[PDB]
Subunit: 390 residues, 4 copies
């Protein structure tokens, strides 16, 4: 009935076919796999890490909740138990579900989403892994340094992996972290927007990667008081504060993109990532730093409306229960040359505020009308203003 029940129902529906199969080493065996009509010929086994890593990144906050014996609590325990077995299989070289770690550049991407999952729920998803599994993750993450990343948002993947290694107490490469955060800052364009590399692209990679991962990296550096070369006293915290303020502005923009009937603009590449476009707004919500311009109720209501409208299309799922290539249903020609149905699991990134308890104000507060909904009703709605000075 309540918005939360819709969200947990959908998250469970997305997660369960992946995790139940992978928990017993049958993901590759059973997963109905689909590649772009313009697939560039790369090894199709990249699909499984895309699927698993992107999924776990998005549902890790949910699974970080304390255990209880409610219906939702039982689902969380089941998903988490499956996930823990899945993590073990993913790095066991003898498992049928051993992921493609050692070839291709793409694993850096999806390993960063795995790292995200551990950073978002360390006590629940990392700490319970056995020591052999932990050692395997450390080794698999470290060997990704073989990849020379594109000079784009991919720099954050390298930073995320090394940040995880740092936090896990393993040997890490600070240069990869520091070089990345410098470039991301250099790529800030203004009024909440970053360039995806040296040239500005009007697309949702600000949501898919840039702002959420930049904030996450800076948060770990700030929390550890990591000694960064030529950072004055307070400087890392100041960088984090600026990053958060920029993402707050981007969140205001994203909420104003949601139409009265729960749609949003479709532009830029990787439009098949569906509700992944809202990761910044979901992150602001989960971490409880929505700007004063946005109430929890309005954000929950707008995101729910968008989610219900998009996932009313049954053709988003195939017979096996896996996500298909598309946006609203099955639209395979929308898939870029680098896209497979594992890639689709980036849509899980909308679910971050499920990491707030069921009795948190985000979930229990009254529904509110979002900006465009008010506007087209002819009702008062707020003026918007640019944020410079960031």
């Amino acid at each position: 009935e309540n918005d939360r029940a819709y969200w947990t129902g959908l998250a469970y529906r997305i997660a369960a076919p992946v995790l139940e199969n992978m928990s017993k080493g049958e993901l590759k065996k059973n997963m109905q796999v689909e590649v772009s009509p313009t697939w560039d010929g790369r090894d199709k086994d990249v699909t499984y890490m895309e699927c698993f890593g992107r999924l776990m990144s998005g549902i890790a906050p949910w699974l970080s909740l304390p255990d209880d014996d409610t219906d939702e609590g039982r689902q969380r325990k089941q998903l988490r138990a499956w996930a823990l077995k899945s993590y073990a299989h993913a790095v066991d070289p003898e498992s049928p579900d051993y992921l493609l770690w050692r070839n291709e550049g793409q694993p850096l991407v999806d390993a960063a989403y795995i790292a995200s999952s551990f950073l978002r729920a360390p006590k629940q998803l990392w700490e319970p892994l056995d020591e052999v599994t932990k050692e395997r993750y450390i080794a698999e993450f470290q060997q990704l340094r073989r990849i020379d990343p594109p000079y784009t948002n991919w720099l954050l993947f390298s930073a995320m992996v090394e940040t995880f290694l740092m936090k896990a107490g393993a040997q890490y490469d600070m240069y990869r972290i520091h070089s990345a955060i410098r470039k991301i800052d250099e790529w800030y364009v203004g009024d909440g927007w970053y360039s995806d590399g040296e040239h500005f692209a009007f697309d949702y990679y600000n949501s898919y990667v840039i702002q959420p991962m930049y904030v996450q990296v800076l948060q770990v550096l700030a929390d550890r008081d990591a000694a960064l070369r030529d950072k004055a006293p307070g400087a890392v915290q100041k960088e984090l504060d600026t990053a958060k303020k920029r993402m707050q502005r981007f969140g205001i923009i994203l909420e104003r993109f949601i139409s009265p009937e729960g749609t949003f603009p479709l532009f830029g590449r990787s439009m098949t990532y569906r509700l992944g476009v809202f990761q910044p707004l979901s992150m602001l919500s989960w971490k409880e730093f929505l700007p004063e311009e946005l109430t929890e109720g309005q954000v929950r209501s707008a995101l729910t409306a968008a989610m219900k409208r998009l996932f009313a299309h049954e053709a988003n799922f195939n017979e096996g229960g896996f996500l298909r290539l598309g946006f609203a249903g099955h639209q395979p020609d929308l898939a870029d040359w680098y896209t497979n149905n594992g890639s689709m699991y980036l849509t899980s990134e909308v679910f971050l505020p499920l990491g707030l308890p069921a009795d948190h104000s985000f979930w229990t507060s009254p529904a509110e009308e979002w900006t465009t909904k008010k506007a087209w009703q002819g009702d008062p709605f707020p003026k918007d203003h640019a944020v410079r000075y960031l």
Copy 2:
């Protein structure tokens, strides 16, 4: 049933007629029900009338540039044009009750640029028929605006537009104002169809309200005249115009992808009270017939019509006198910025540019088509979008 044009001309007439009928007889200030922002900064309220008239004429000038005919629409065009010609004369006659506020404030540079836009968009129909005394008055009023030192923002284009008009009119003009402006606008291109409104990027619709339409219009006149600009070789101005057009084509693709299946669009940035003025680039691409291959005329007409019908279904957009009110969808006065009055609202006229294509043009007669988001949310095929990174 299937006549989008009739909806557009009906709305444009409804917006234009109360302004032009009153101003044609020097009674705009007498009769216009005027409204200022709740946070009005205290400037002289007479700025309202130039905002109203200038912004209106900019948007309907293409429509009124059509050849005369004796259809119902043709009769409306003749009536509007006759009123407009008398209005232009009153606007610069120092003895007219409707003499505009030319000589005080900075704001007149803004709205004079929209007047200049109207003359550049329909020179034969709106400029040439003015009597010689009126023309000389415009030239003098435009020239004295050089007293204004503009903000280092989109306002540079206002100065450029006025000077470009003066150049085209055969008057004394200041090439430095034109050239410095076009250099800055180019320097402010950020990428993938977007410019900064000055040195700092703002995510708002000023790319639509001012920057891209006026940049393209200035470059078009310079290219057409083969104007000798410092260190621009033969063909160099045309190359700048080609780039400007390509950037605006990309911005047009973005704007079409902003239109929701139910005819709404995102609301962000300042001056959201400009309503359908957000679509000026798409309307300009349509009118000047350089929509990129990604966009069909039918899909653009259909999407714009849907947005227009939905927004102007709100009766509260108009007051008792027939003038636009402060708001977006209806009367939402607190949306008005400190610099906004109900004359400012007439920038919504900038959607009407493709009315300058004849009624029997393919833009108007082609079958309706579904726009991008409408296809997408139906679960139907819709195109991949791609950044344009090379401009």
Copy 3:
């Protein structure tokens, strides 16, 4: 005997053939004129405004001094008397020495140097002109708005002319001033250096034009702001511009070798001691940074001046400057260069605008940086200024 006497002797030698001839409308008649071997074919009459304007810009501070009846005082009076008549001829359409105001783009350049002369000595060079002459200057300066300048240091020429018009109480174009100062600031590269337009060039146009004119324009704007309102942002801009020029001055002093030479790079190397205009301006306006003493600056500049102007071939038979650097080196002249252009070397003379009994002139000689260094003596570490 003293350094000052060398400087005034040279300034007089440079100035007198120009001003004596032009004062009686015989500059074009008598001036032995020389153009670049690669002269681009423009009207050669540009030469006379280049000569007169660049000269007056550089000697205006000297001639701004109060009168006295010393030998130097007599030279100042004579030069000023000739200059006043010359200014009148320059804008009288019936004079044989009427300058080329109305055609070409080059007049914007040299008109800016004329404007500089009036801004640097208004009471002595502008105010005594008769009303008809003043009206003619205002009209001639205003019609230069016909020129669409290169997107380079030339923006400052337009700014300088309009700044003069503003100061003179005439109709002026603030947009020309403001757009120029914005671009110049945008073209600051760092550590005292600006780009000459959108592309950095390693040359002395920072000295010839950019920093001295940027500072002068800002100073007038700041003085007008201060005469009103709460301190404006223009004061901060002027402060930054001065600090940048202080750093550039430190760099210029470190360019002077122990034997009074300096590096030769970039275009317009025929401008000779014009390379030192920022250092001369810092000295005249008394804001040398603490790193530089007046004595060391005077000593270094004198050494450079004596060595360069020991070459007799710098002057032709008529007493006019020739194309070259140290002597007659005509192939050094760019396609836009004539011997009138050479008078930009007058810009070294700015500290002659300080009285003969000022500390700049009376303080003990001091060793300059490289002179100390190559003696094996202590000399200061240099530091980048990265915060401007």
Copy 4:
């Protein structure tokens, strides 16, 4: 015979270092001096600064084939000492084991060691025994612990990894690629780069930036390294541009030399003496002087500057080591990070000794340099910006 002056000076600088280090007595015997404003770091950094900077500058000279001339005898002696020195430098049991494992400064001087190996691989790297080679590889690799300043130091990391790549060891392409991107981004124009995000008017363009950028790109181009999102020919184009920029900087440096063999003193680290001419020396050694510069004029100008600066006996201490200063002993000129080992960057002027004694660079007639012609009142060329790079 300009060459004999150069080899005499290079030998005088090199021999006290290499003879002592060859027998593990550099730390024992070297008369060491730190800045009056020394920041308190471990003074053992001095020895790697000394050895690495020395070897970088004389490596071209020592790359020449052996012969039976007087100079040939000196080269053989220096090279034999250097080979023993390289072995001691990485032997953890040697008294002269360098400070590899602590401080950030070792990244700097290890890059100069790597430079020496890249400049003379057959003569200085290949003859090292396999244990010594393995030790170098390990010592270079562990420098990845250092998070470099966002400055010219990025090239040190690139240089080390480039050496590792060329040596056939495990290398980090990310360190190389990120560095070359930043250096290109820091090009300001007309031959000048910024030392990091803010332009500094100083000679770090000479000490580090242009010579190391060109060297890194040259190895990448020669190997035909497949770099991320660099199309075929992209690396070659970057190398070509880098060389053209350094040609312009070389023209500028030649025009800095006064008629009496001085040059401007500006920016930090002015104690590096003739290290300011490394780009001009490199252009000469690698034979890509631009047409504006003849070998004769460059040799003559550099010789004049070198003779005038090293006429000051106080440049050397009693032990024969360089002292803190510029022209003599001027210790207050030393920055807080400077010791007398740092001074050995002045060896970077010697690169064209890597051209044989019978090469045109050495045998061509002396020519007058630009300022010398200018102040004589003689014709000299117009200079022009290169704005298109």
